[PDB]
Write a protein that binds this ligand. Structure first.
Ligand SMILES: [Mg+2]
Ligand SMILES: [Mg+2]
Ligand SMILES: [Mg+2]
Ligand SMILES: [Mg+2]
Ligand SMILES: [Mg+2]
Ligand SMILES: [Mg+2]
Ligand SMILES: [Mg+2]
Ligand SMILES: [Mg+2]
Lengths: 239, 213, 239, 213
RNA sequence: GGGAUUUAGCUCAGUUGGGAGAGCGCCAGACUGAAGAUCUGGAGGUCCUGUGUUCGAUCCACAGAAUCCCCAC
RNA sequence: GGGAUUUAGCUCAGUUGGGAGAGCGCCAGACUGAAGAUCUGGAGGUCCUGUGUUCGAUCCACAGAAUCCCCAC
């Protein structure tokens, strides 16, 4: 007869994935470029950075594309309580994005926890990057089919059956070359921490000493996670 | 999948209680009044109303006081999925409140599901209102003695009963008996007609059951 | 890094449904009559009664058919802890059935908790009784198709697509009249408590006094739960 | 559906610990010895082996002492569904044990999942073995002083350290230092070759990690 | 609604920033015919956790955890 | 591995079975110029929960819950 879900806990490592609820209806039509708008993509990335920076929570890094963000945690607040983490994080992101996009009508993120083994972490972000690719192809495919004259649900149903390579070949034949499009559209964006060597004055030693500062960086030209270039890339992020 | 809680569910009826994460620290840094603020109070109520009207999740009514809101659901959104309900509702409220107060820095609500039986619904809101009262007296007692620091005010407030807090506060120009009802008892936003009630009765001395019909 | 599921709790009213895991392989071939064996059905019913009687747990009644049993609880042991209840109950049932069937090879029940509103309880047992009916029709349908010459998986796949009335009509045309078969096969069995007025001696009063004794009874001729006869039947059980 | 926990899951690796529900009360009523019984001990070990061999769920190995068994799973059965894993395993063990002891009255195991990290697997079994030792000394101290009642034996046993329990038990013809290793440390049943080890080492003074490979 | 506590096995100090101590207790030693007591040496540290600020954090900032308590009930 | 506790707002009694009490405290009353103290009356009960046994359960049987504690760590 109580708050029975409040004792549900998760154990690190854990990924939190937040996804915009019905964003193509709640963020339209407010003048966003179709099919992609870099202003929105930047807002998503900045939202992720603001969370890492000032939420008080400490995710290692973030991977965002479309309207979703995945945060990797090796340490969890609220003793790993699922309700606490999902609600607070989704609420912070909803608020932050509302500010950066200067919205006048409310939006919402959902949130869910993905329990992983340490060794499984590269596999998770690979799966999400695959989703990013299909999202990328389907978005441009939808944009083309709609403007040519196909109905909203006709184009929607059409793309869900077709595979990623098929729609890609379709855009090809229509004069739409996806290989020229920016990397952030195709592979998404990484928000992580990188080391920065600095110099300060030890008033005692009377000398200059070297220390390190971890600064938050957005990478808009990331590699393919499952590749010879991508494996050590992810490996360094996860450390 | 590895989404091991994603299909954890609740059954109707259910109550979602959302509570502002560290609001008193945050909003004070923005210039809001303590322990209560009318502008914030209206924003909370408007946020609740906007949720009832615009979320599409259709709660019966909401009860709000301080920085918390409780929603009663008789029909369940998102197939009763706990993670989705807690996160989406908390996110909507966070976004809505941000808009109402036009904040320039992000805030956050938490959210939990209270799996009540139908018989216990009036009991829950009664206890919430009791909490509203104890918080009303305690926070006014504390945040008035701080005009003296944290541990000083608390140590000063140790063991003195409610009536003594009233008399103590009155000598320092604070009259608990005449402060607005939204501070003492909270605010009800209910349902198509949506109404805010800023002068509610005490719950446990039939009003609620009649409200739920 | 702990027993994180041990604080998962449920709230009454609740139905526990236990179902035999792979029973048609783990209980075969030990000479059971096909497609139905009343010895097995009695073992299931007696297992349910033994649980109500001597497990220390207090379900109101039980509904069993095939290899499943549903117990209605209005009060829960272990503070409603899901892991505790599922494991202990399934273990008790597995042990009890092992005894009554005199098994030499181990079997297993699964178990799951069904959270209900008080008003929803008749709906649950209706759904299960529907399942009992489909189970009944499909069992006889499978028995007929197999003996006629159809393969194990051919007959299995065949029945899953066909509806209950269709297979029923099939048995009809084959000379198999399901309407003549016993009620326990078609609708299952209820195990519940009924009041029994008794008489004892108050040594003080020197007179005979009347008190009540709740005795556990098996009903092998139950009505259809969703009918004018069935609604008050269930209503009295749930009280 | 209303099966609100049916899709709650865990991830590998995981440990299932099953513990006999009220075994000491039950099995004593059947004539078994207290606090330990060789016949019961063999039945527990055989039950564990039979599970590893015949369940199809394929655990790496099992550690048993008293009336509990811990199984290590590196690959998850039933898609990691908690309710199904706890119930089916507990049911299998209950059935298996019933067969091994040829009981005429039903018994029951409980079961819980211990969501350990891979790093912590040796730590878990070490703590379990520590529990095995503390239970070995305590139960022998208690169930020997009862030959004197419940509260008497406990009150008698209050505050006396382990060494004092040893000396106390020796004067009454009970030598803890020479009792079998399966009482002191427990039994390992591991893996295709399945082996029972009734003379195991102390875990935390590399054996386990080598066992898990 | 609020406060306090968290540091060696145990009970507790640490100048609001320059690499953390005491007392019981434990180990060893001598005092010597031997203990027991007392002196000496020794061992014991996730300064509750995470992230920041800083040349540097037990200490400050942000966000958390656990325990006790006031109010309330 | 074990023990103990659970009863009025609070602290606690109840013959191992015939419808549960005390003390603080509260309410009222008098003692009277008034309190404060003391006498009187009064109010307060999920006898922790569920199911059994019994004509009858705070009490016995079976199974649970919460808190404290020993052992262990
Ligand atoms: Mg979306
Ligand atoms: Mg999306
Ligand atoms: Mg708050
Ligand atoms: Mg609050
Ligand atoms: Mg089955
Ligand atoms: Mg079945
Ligand atoms: Mg046990
Ligand atoms: Mg045990």
């Amino acid at each position: 007869t109580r708050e029975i879900y409040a004792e549900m806990r998760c154990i690190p490592p854990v990924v939190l994935r937040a996804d915009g609820r019905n964003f193509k209806n709640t963020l339209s039509g407010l003048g966003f470029e179709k099919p992609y708008d870099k202003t929105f993509a930047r807002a998503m990335a900045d939202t992720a950075e603001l969370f890492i920076k000032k939420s008080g929570l400490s995710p290692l890094f973030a991977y965002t594309f479309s309207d979703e963000i995945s945060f990797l945690f090796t340490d969890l607040p609220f003793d790993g309580r699922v309700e606490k983490i999902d609600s607070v994080v989704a609420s912070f992101l909803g608020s932050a994005l509302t500010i950066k996009l200067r919205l006048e009508e409310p939006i919402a993120f959902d949130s869910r926890l993905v329990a992983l083994q340490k060794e499984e972490i590269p596999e998770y972000f690979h799966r999400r990057q695959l989703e990013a690719w299909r999202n990328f192809v389907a978005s441009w495919g939808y944009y083309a089919l709609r403007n040519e004259g196909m109905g909203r649900n006709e184009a929607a149903k059409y793309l869900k059956r077709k595979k990623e390579s098929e729609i890609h070949e379709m855009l090809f034949e229509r004069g739409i070359n996806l290989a020229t499009l920016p990397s952030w559209q195709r592979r998404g964006v990484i928000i992580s921490k990188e080391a920065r060597e600095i110099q300060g004055f030890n008033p005692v030693s009377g000398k200059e000493e070297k220390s390190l500062r971890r600064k938050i960086t957005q990478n808009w030209e990331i590699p393919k996670f499952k590749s010879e270039k991508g494996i050590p890339f992810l490996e360094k992020l996860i450390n």
